[PDB]
Design a protein around this ligand. Structure first.
Ligand SMILES: O=C(O)c1cc2ccccc2cc1O
Ligand SMILES: O=C(O)c1cc2ccccc2cc1O
Lengths: 391, 391
């Protein structure tokens, strides 16, 4: 039962997450079932990870085949899946200069790799945005712009300056010839699906290039085609110096990547970085399968179409609790006129939908890219009652 | 072909590992096969990760079963495998106070969690050993005692003091009432399987206890039953405040853990730490299978028995290049009288064996716990010619 599972959790787990309110038993596609038999339509994807939902046959096949061929070896040895995955990610980025890949296990680790890259420029100053999220390890936590998550762990590694997200003048003023790198999410996810103004990413690219700073785009949450281009920054026609990926990269299997373009790709020399599990054949095979399905089923273009319709349906409700809808593709935020997002998360759960109160007044959606339009339509139809009950 | 695979590696991978000398295509048990069809007996286990070797049926079964049931959910939801794994790990530690578990993806992340735990004591000073290896992310790299690997990324998170490993009075002098934590490997793996003097870990436990500092034992490489006890520190009759695990924990699947005992288990409160993939059902299911097999097949005792026989066999060779063999169970270092370990790595490869030159004069072995006695016997018999060819 849910009570029994929660009691077991509380007896053994550290309390860094609190106690989960529901205990899940099974999942298939975009539908999960708790241990008491209740079903839920998953509009959150385990926080943007389950790009292909649960039990996707291509991921299952890839993992099973690879485990029956060759498992972990470490990077003392070259293995096919990681090399092929690196080739595919480089092709997807489409940079004009040579691009090189480092594999790791998580978004924090990918940003730690980028942090270490920035040190090799000879500069130690870094710029990120207030309310940005880049991970929880000591280096990535310094880049994260969330004082609540940071101050108990001070001092953090330096020297980071945080500026208002989307503020071109503030960014131009903070970046100078001592700035190693600027880290930006193309849409701030954890903060509440905060989309920057038109032209902001292009300004960031110009500012950084002019001052010799690396532009690092954290695509851990916005990548994997979620916004209707493989990398969200591709909507703005820029090429950053470094891109980080994780979350949906392995369709559920733990894997992250740091891609570096041009001179930044040559900064790491032998012995200067590594990760034991990085690039392992099983997780790389899963990620290769995810890329294959995204391509074969046209899921990147589909995410744009479904997200546009979803945004319009929510806006068409005219519900007084909804201030506006924001995001792109299948990363969407419902900004509320009053801080009832946590209550709306609960009432959505009662109605069988998994959503996220990303901020007191923002409901975040990040559904599997395989979600059916009917499931999105059903959520839109359920939303007025969900919101009425929240207040 | 090896040349084509290595050329593909060099075209796309960052150069932080150099270029691997061989490309592996398949593995089964303790035997791996390269792309040219050559077989090698794996005495390194992918750097102590493949505790059950490749294609172990219990791991394959657990992973395939869980993938066909429920994949990643995130820790917004309670799920069975992670809870059960935490329960099993707490039982194996056998501490007398309540122990709590945090899951992550890697050894670096496990030590980052411990690093952040130590911040919550109210102190910022940390002590580790010269030549210790604790990971490559910014926080874990500050603990790692390798200036050549740390200097390029300075400044690192503070305030860390390094002391000579095994030196009781040096540790006592460095630990004071401002020390948050001492980090120690029970045997220094990366440095060359450096075993501390008898009583040293117990002295570290006493020194930290008297000064109010946490004792953090990094069992990422020494754990998983490799030394003949589940945790290597259990040979010494102490209970640390924090234990970190990774590498072999998932039999190859990426997973790490931070266990904290007593008051240290309560430091992390809701929202203060997390990892998206941490505790996911698939990797936790693999780890549970590893624990089941270690117990059912008596592999922890087997590691002690085979380790003793292996050490005795190598020493019985009376080879002039071998100074001594050190370590415990199936973590062994062959310490040489001259710096030919790197050459011996290549000549061992020529003879069909994968070993590691951990230091210029130390060959490290960490074979799967399922390795055949005859596979070890063949290595010992081949070792004289391997060393003669190396010189
Ligand atoms: O994790 C590491 O730091 C690492 C470094 C290497 C350095 C040279 C070759 C292989 C390596 C494999 C690793 O996992
Ligand atoms: O990685 C995190 O920081 C994280 C924090 C949580 C905090 C509360 C509940 C669930 C959470 C899940 C996460 O992955």
């Amino acid at each position: 039962t849910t009570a029994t599972m929660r009691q077991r959790w509380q007896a053994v787990m550290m309390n860094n997450y609190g106690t989960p309110p529901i205990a899940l038993a099974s999942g298939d596609g975009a539908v999960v079932t708790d241990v008491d038999g209740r079903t839920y339509i998953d509009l959150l994807g385990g926080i943007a990870v389950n790009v292909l939902g649960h039990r996707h046959p291509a991921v299952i096949e890839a993992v099973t085949r690879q485990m029956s061929t060759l498992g972990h070896t470490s990077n003392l040895y070259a293995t096919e899946p990681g090399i092929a995955l690196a080739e595919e990610l480089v092709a997807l980025l489409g940079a004009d200069q040579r691009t090189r890949v480092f594999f790791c296990n998580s978004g924090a680790e990918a940003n730690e790799a980028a942090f270490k890259l920035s040190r090799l420029t000879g500069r130690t100053k870094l710029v990120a945005a207030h309310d940005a999220f880049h991970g929880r390890t000591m280096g990535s936590l310094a880049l994260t712009g969330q004082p609540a998550k940071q101050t108990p762990f001070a001092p953090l590694p330096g020297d980071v300056t945080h500026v208002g997200y989307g503020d071109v003048d503030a960014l131009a003023a903070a970046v100078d010839d001592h700035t190693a790198a600027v880290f930006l999410e193309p849409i701030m996810g954890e903060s509440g699906v905060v989309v920057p103004p038109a032209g902001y990413l292009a300004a960031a690219r110009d500012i950084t290039a002019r001052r010799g700073a690396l532009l690092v785009l954290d695509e851990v949450q916005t990548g994997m085609g979620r916004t209707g281009a493989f990398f969200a920054h591709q909507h703005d026609g820029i090429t950053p110096d470094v891109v980080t990926l994780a979350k949906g990269l392995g369709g559920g299997l733990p894997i992250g990547a740091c891609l570096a373009v041009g001179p930044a790709a040559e900064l790491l020399t032998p012995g200067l970085h590594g990760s034991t599990f990085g690039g392992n054949p099983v997780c790389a095979a899963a990620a290769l399968a995810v890329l294959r399905v995204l391509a074969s089923d046209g899921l990147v273009r589909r995410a744009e179409v479904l997200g546009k319709s979803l945004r319009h349906g929510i806006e068409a409700l005219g519900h007084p609790l909804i201030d506006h809808v924001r995001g792109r593709g299948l990363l969407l935020g419902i900004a509320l006129t009053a801080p009832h997002a946590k209550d709306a998360e609960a009432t959505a759960r009662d109605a069988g939908y998994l959503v996220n109160a990303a901020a007191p007044d923002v409901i975040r959606l990040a559904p599997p890219l395989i979600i059916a339009e009917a499931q999105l339509d059903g959520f839109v139809a359920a939303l007025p009652a969900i919101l009425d009950r929240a207040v």
